[model samples]
Target: GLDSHELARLHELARHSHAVITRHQDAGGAYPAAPTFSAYRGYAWLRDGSFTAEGISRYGDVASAGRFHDWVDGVLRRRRGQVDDLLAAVDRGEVPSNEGMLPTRFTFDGNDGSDPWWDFQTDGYGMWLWSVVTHAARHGLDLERWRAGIDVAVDYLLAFWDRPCYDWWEEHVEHRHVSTLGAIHGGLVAVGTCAALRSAPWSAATLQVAARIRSLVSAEGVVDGHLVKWLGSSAVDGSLPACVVPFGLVPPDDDVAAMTRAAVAKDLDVDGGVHRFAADVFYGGGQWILLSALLGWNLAAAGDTAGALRHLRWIADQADADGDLPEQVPHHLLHPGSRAEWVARWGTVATPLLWSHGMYLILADELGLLP
Candidate 1:
């Protein structure tokens, strides 16, 4: 049981998470990844926004989450023609270049962000599908409001879920990440199982593709009974637990799930803080607040309340005096020599990262600590 001080701090952090995310949400419904972060300012990522919206939704902010889904719906609707063109190219046996693919992030007004970016990640589309559907189901809202965007995302992912793209961190454009596939699987399965979306033309195909993704992962993504960072890799990533939790890559109790959780705990976790991967060197690959929360969320789901609380406490301790959470902390650097270069290029680490706050809310909610 949490003491009064511990409980109060956890509740205060949950409240701060909501306040920061809502305060920074764009009027056009985009959740800026980090409003003051140099590289991420003026942009909203479906990946980041989807999770942020999930946190908002779970925290009982329906209006905020609804507006976010509405924003994404409008963004995708505008890209309908572009998605069609890409599908046509695919059917013509002319796989579009990565440049021709839909972008990973967008401006607040729904256009592609102007800055040069890695620009191609399909996981966000899948994540949005899961997030929106989960939100609607949780609140008993009508799915028709966002069905058009859902259609666009489904068509795009259905055509390209197997294509290699950037991982969650926007690196490795050449490998098919198991986490990416798990996100797609979770999205497809969400809509596939929804009675409201049963009439969707892609409904049956969605489940079939999801199964195919699971089969592919079972064949190549698992190494030594734990899911790897990517297919054919033996290393585990901190993000892998996300596939077990919200992403539903596997049941939390599945042996593979347990092994994956243990593997990440062994390789990446340090005193309850989680790193992206052993090879990560962005800002010297410090422990990420969001990954720690994700691991906590999974731990709570697997009935390890104490383990989850340790991670929750670690996250709470990372908060600044203003209650803002940074993207990662330098308490432990994976590659100490690699830190300065990124600092010179991107300045300091992203503070008040909405995704970090969002993940904190999710884990807090899982632990019934939301205020």
Candidate 2:
């Protein structure tokens, strides 16, 4: 189905993705968002690391993925007291401020990053639960190694999964994003269905909350038969495909899922490149390599291997001479006028974004392109 030259390059890119990810991994096991990017330097987002670890796991780097889980485990284990305090406050009828919630990004050693951020995202914890559980199942590894952190995450998510918070893009701090809900649903379902985790006190509760999330999305998160960006918004986002493939907000073949795929392709994709959202202005709303890979992953899952390969090739085209992937490419920018200011502020787009490479691995694996 692929020419020799195309196959060779794709496989080579897959190898590069693995090398770059492991090479940049922190000694403490955290995968930095970008080693040299101005704002992302020295910090790791749970959302980013979880996906990166998923790629590494799928690439069959068991040791690296395990260490990342260990790092997240230790970090979350330390937050047990904080989560308990928050739950206790909830029980007392006290709604905590957004500032009091767990942060979105942390330093390699697990402390909250010192910089100001839109940090109240719950999707990361959900993603971690799904990632770790998937990794364990894929490798036949014991879940016991990360149980303490899993316990903490399960407790935290069950307590506040429906709360309005930031989306995966770290914007829109006031809406309940469907993609975020899908991530939580995926996580809860992962552990909820796992027999090894069935003994945990929260197993039944996790599934209950997952069903609740699905109901909420069904009632308010869909529009015109396609999933929306936020609960009531009609906009499509690059992240929505994730809700179909891995997150399982709906089955990949469902009409809603097909509508969502078509909507995102019509509204966001330009020649195989995927934009974050129509209104995104960060870096002038460029096409993100990672989002393209995500859409490709979904396409492959739905049996559109040719469509997936087109996206994979687009991603490969974005790679630099060193085979490094950027966070986004400026081509087909939705807000061209807004681009200069971000370059002036952040110094340039984040080059060698590990999330980009990670998504590449995911898409490649989905296409059976990984070497």
In the range 1-371, model 1's lDDT, one tens digit per residue, is 89999999889889999999999999988899999999999999998998999999999999999999999999999999999999999899998898878887798999888422364789999999999999999999999999999999999999999998889988898999988999999999999999999889999999999999999999999999999999989999898997888888799999999999999999999999899999998999999999999999999999999999999999999999999999999999899899999999999999999999999999998988898
lDDT of residue 274 for candidate 1: 95
Tens digits of per-residue lDDT, candidate 2, 1-371, equal: 88999999889989999999999999999999999899899999888998999999999999999999999999999999999999999999997888888888898989988432455899999999999999999999999999999999999999999899889888888899989999999999999999899899998999999999999999999999999999999998999998998998888899999999999999999999999999999989999999999999999889899899899999999999999999999889999999999999988899899999999999999888888
Question: Model 2 clash pairs?
Answer: none
CA lDDT of each candidate? 0.93, 0.93
Stretches off by above 4 angstroms in model 2 are 114-117
Whole-model lDDT, model 1: 0.93
Model 1 Cα shift for residue 207 (angstroms): 0.5
